[PDB]
Amino acid sequence: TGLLDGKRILVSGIITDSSIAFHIARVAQEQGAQLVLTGFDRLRLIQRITDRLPAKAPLLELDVQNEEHLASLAGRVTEAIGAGNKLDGVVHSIGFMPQTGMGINPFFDAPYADVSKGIHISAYSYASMAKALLPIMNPGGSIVGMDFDPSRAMPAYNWMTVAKSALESVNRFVAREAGKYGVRSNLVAAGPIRTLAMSAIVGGALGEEAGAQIQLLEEGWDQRAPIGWNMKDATPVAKTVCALLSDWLPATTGDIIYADGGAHTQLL
Amino acid sequence: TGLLDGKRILVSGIITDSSIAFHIARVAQEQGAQLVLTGFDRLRLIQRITDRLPAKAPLLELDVQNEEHLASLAGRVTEAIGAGNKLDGVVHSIGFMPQTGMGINPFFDAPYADVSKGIHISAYSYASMAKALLPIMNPGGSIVGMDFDPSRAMPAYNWMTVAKSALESVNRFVAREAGKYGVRSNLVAAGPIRTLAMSAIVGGALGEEAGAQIQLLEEGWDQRAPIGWNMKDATPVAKTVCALLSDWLPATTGDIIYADGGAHTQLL
Amino acid sequence: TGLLDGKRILVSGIITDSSIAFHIARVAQEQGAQLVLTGFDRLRLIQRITDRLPAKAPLLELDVQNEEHLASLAGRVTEAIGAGNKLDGVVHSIGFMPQTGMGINPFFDAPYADVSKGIHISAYSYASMAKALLPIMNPGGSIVGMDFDPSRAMPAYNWMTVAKSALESVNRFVAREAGKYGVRSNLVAAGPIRTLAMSAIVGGALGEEAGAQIQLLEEGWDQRAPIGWNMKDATPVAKTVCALLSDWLPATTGDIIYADGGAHTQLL
Amino acid sequence: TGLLDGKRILVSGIITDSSIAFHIARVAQEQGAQLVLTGFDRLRLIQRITDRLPAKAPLLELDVQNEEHLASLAGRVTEAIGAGNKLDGVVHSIGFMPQTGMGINPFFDAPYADVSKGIHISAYSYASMAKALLPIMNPGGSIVGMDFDPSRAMPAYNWMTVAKSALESVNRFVAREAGKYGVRSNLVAAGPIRTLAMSAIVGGALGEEAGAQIQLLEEGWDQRAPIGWNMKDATPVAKTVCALLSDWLPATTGDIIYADGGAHTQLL
Ligand SMILES: NC(=O)c1ccc[n+]([C@@H]2O[C@H](COP(=O)([O-])OP(=O)(O)OC[C@H]3O[C@@H](n4cnc5c(N)ncnc54)[C@H](O)[C@@H]3O)[C@@H](O)[C@H]2O)c1
Ligand SMILES: NC(=O)c1ccc[n+]([C@@H]2O[C@H](COP(=O)([O-])OP(=O)(O)OC[C@H]3O[C@@H](n4cnc5c(N)ncnc54)[C@H](O)[C@@H]3O)[C@@H](O)[C@H]2O)c1
Ligand SMILES: NC(=O)c1ccc[n+]([C@@H]2O[C@H](COP(=O)([O-])OP(=O)(O)OC[C@H]3O[C@@H](n4cnc5c(N)ncnc54)[C@H](O)[C@@H]3O)[C@@H](O)[C@H]2O)c1
């Protein structure tokens, strides 16, 4: 009945009620999934946010740069879902690039310390979470991560786009490892979504030039998309993630599903 | 409950019980869809084959090279499903290339009359069916066609691969037109499936050289696929088509979903 | 000294002094190549046009839809360059799609007779010319064809884009055959060039809607290109074709080189 | 006469006489270029190696992880080529990934410290060198870097492939910056070349499993390539780099040229 009835799914990446992962979690619960949530740093805030989900879910702390958090993660999940139970799904919805790499300054001005932190959080951590959680995943399981199509350079978000190029490559290798467990690994490449951070950047948080370029980027998306694109509505993206978590794409792995209104298939 | 409960879906392309479209139809009916079937030329044979589906379905004749069949198709579908009802889904599972283009002779020996017939049936007809059926499709509907990844040349099936390259391009334009109706258009790129025609070719129907090349092509597929690939089992492909017919990929159009075990994401 | 000193090269596709093939021929002669030209239908006009090239060149008639022209072509070339001499290069600069397929009407209104004629001239003929000329090509030779990136759908030129998708696929198979002769086969994907036909379409030859869409398409190209794009200057495209005809890309075949200002690598 | 007559070109990446950059330098000098070389760490060794080039060239020390080396690089180049002279070309032939990331252990066992060092040297440094050298490059200049097609995952060299995915993305952004100077930026994606490090790995330096997988990877390359692939001969790769350094690909930037025998265009 529900698309994800009886499935146990870990969802990372909630920080506000406009996080893509908040809508992934809401839709997954609507479809019968039992969730375990992970959050970074502001756990009191995240608990208050996730109190608004349709069902209660245990919240675990996870800083993906903390090797001790990752080393203990599987045992804390098993404690939360009960011994003898394993996960059927894992959602990676985690990304960050320090400001020096996202247009507040020229691409050339980002120090490598900043780029390497962003690639750690946004790309390497996808392999990190798979390594931690595959030992407690059931055959037929599914790992899904969030992507923004990096196949062409864009005016702003420069180093973040490089990090997404690395993530797409990491995903293909995670699929190799996950296949030994009977588990699939895929990314959902979403169009632009007006999260709190996104709206701040359009408002000029990283400079007027970066704001104007991203606003024009957003506008062309809805113009290109044959079915349109609503940057204020994350539900179509959440449904696509749930599709990959379900049993209905069983021969897809190492791959990228585009939830972008079809915009990437059109020129003008 | 059922993935496709209450949806009205037209399925083309059944000719034997090993047709990919036979398994698409079976799975769609398992998931609550009400079907209308179309068949080419041997309608008595196709009716006997489809008597084995879990539910009865009206069968309409459709030769996609016959402009009179296409001009009458929408009215015959409306008669079959009842006035005031429209389609929610359309499945194109149609392909053919005369033997001169598929390895029985060198690529250079195929006369254009043969190539143009194959491109008519295998690529142009996707636009033909969309033109005929979009006027009787509901908003939120879905058109799905079958593909075999043509991004690289392969030893055999040469002109058929050229026809698939054309089909992928046709799909992106059909998505533009379908979007005006609130309808999505996508292809499923399947790995090799042992249909009756496929087994005959491996058995040497088009020459020993073509048979040996296709057998080695099949074997590398399961070796590359991180989750494996079973050429004897079309159900994973049928489930993927049903996923695209459902409401769970609502922001994907003009696109290609790979149901190939992940083989196209791996080198060796 | 000259990039193409001593090379014997056949160049198809001249019809006016704004043809891309006119500039290919001019640059090749500047670089020391000895040319044989082929022309379609209006041979008196083409001879008057090519009288303006820096050197005289024999002109042969070639309608690529005429099997008798193709069957005699190799012998007529050998007569023109002398017995015991072979070609080092072949340039395919041929394209056509009847008006019903290029935006004067909706994509769905093109009859297949029109599409099949356009695919014959624009895609199948690349294999046709390779079949005719490979028997009289030297090892180390090069076949080059002209392309317009069809990986995404564009507002107009719809069926012509489908034909380019087919041509890219044909090129990969021609490379397989040409390799047995020690010959490379590649396409140059050019940005928009203001030929006489192009200017007529922008002027509204195929309707005001098609004209406006193509004008906006052209403008975004120069905006995207990191080094800019001058649609009035075919010389950068001609130089790229000469690069592929030379010995300086000796390990590239079945491939596509983009002479588009870098526009296809950028989003906005 | 010479392809690169009068051009001033910096070439990084020589360490042995089997380095790809050694053959790039040799061919560039054969074609009239005046070189400045950069080398990492073992400068006495590199000078003895480059004494075998057809012409003497100044050698400058450059560790791309050393910000002081990069901050002084432009001034040291200007001293070497003379005040009032600028560079016409820059070759990046630099790559490294610590052993934990290249198959001596499972992909999951590479610590991020190792991955981040490899991405620093193999990808970020392409932007680092462009930032340092664009202020002393002439309009019409060219930056070229070395690539190994990372679009699909391969058995070994795992994290190095992720680093190449990042490099391809970096190249598209460097093209944006370089265009303001009238300079192009491109990568050459080479097939496998038997450098000293490559032969050591096939010999089992990183374990027997990694050695066997890379040997089978090499063998399929020559089998796929329509013109063949000779892993013992770097000259076709060097010629392709020289083609991009020349004026004969003037409308290509942000792009990738494949010098791989056509292998990436073929499946089997
Ligand atoms: N336009 C968009 O918003 C958009 C489009 C496509 C893809 N994405 C991707 O979707 C993902 C979710 O981003 P979002 O748009 O929902 O914004 P968001 O700010 O709501 O989510 C980012 C999440 O990353 C988490 N995070 C940051 N550092 C972490 C760390 N060290 N350890 C663990 N978690 C950490 C944040 O706590 C936060 O929960 C990101 O990968 C993003 O790049 C976003
Ligand atoms: N390995 C595979 O079998 C494989 C893999 C990927 C994609 N595909 C694609 O899946 C589609 C279905 O093929 P299949 O493998 O199930 O083989 P199949 O022979 O069972 O189906 C082919 C169908 O095309 C129909 N057809 C032929 N000419 C027609 C015409 N003039 N009008 C209407 N219908 C016509 C046949 O009647 C038949 O029903 C094809 O597009 C095929 O290329 C097949
Ligand atoms: N914007 C552009 O102009 C552009 C951009 C990229 C690629 N191209 C491609 O470059 C090629 C050359 O086109 P062009 O732009 O120089 O326009 P053009 O009109 O000058 O050249 C087209 C050529 O095709 C030839 N041709 C048509 N039918 C033929 C037949 N039956 N047999 C032999 N030749 C025939 C014409 O005679 C003409 O010489 C075409 O393939 C075109 O699609 C053009």
Ligand SMILES: NC(=O)c1ccc[n+]([C@@H]2O[C@H](COP(=O)([O-])OP(=O)(O)OC[C@H]3O[C@@H](n4cnc5c(N)ncnc54)[C@H](O)[C@@H]3O)[C@@H](O)[C@H]2O)c1
């Ligand atoms: N099969 C192949 O060999 C192959 C194929 C395609 C691409 N490539 C790429 O070609 C490039 C050249 O590699 P190669 O195959 O000639 O091997 P190589 O070992 O001869 O060259 C590697 C070079 O990187 C340099 N380097 C390492 N660390 C450095 C640092 N901190 N600062 C500056 N330089 C540093 C080395 O000193 C060495 O000169 C690399 O980017 C490689 O990935 C190699």
Ligand SMILES: O=C(O)c1cc2ccccc2cc1O
């Ligand atoms: O990685 C992202 O989250 C991302 C979001 C974007 C949102 C708007 C425009 C460009 C963007 C590029 C990105 O890499």
Ligand SMILES: O=C(O)c1cc2ccccc2cc1O
């Ligand atoms: O179009 C197809 O149905 C097709 C099937 C194949 C099946 C096996 C190998 C190659 C194949 C290529 C094709 O284009």
Ligand SMILES: O=C(O)c1cc2ccccc2cc1O
């Ligand atoms: O094939 C072509 O010649 C072609 C030219 C174009 C020129 C301008 C815009 C779109 C275009 C699409 C094409 O397929």
Ligand SMILES: O=C(O)c1cc2ccccc2cc1O
């Ligand atoms: O980056 C490289 O140098 C590289 C070389 C290879 C050489 C042989 C096989 C795989 C390889 C993968 C790589 O990323």
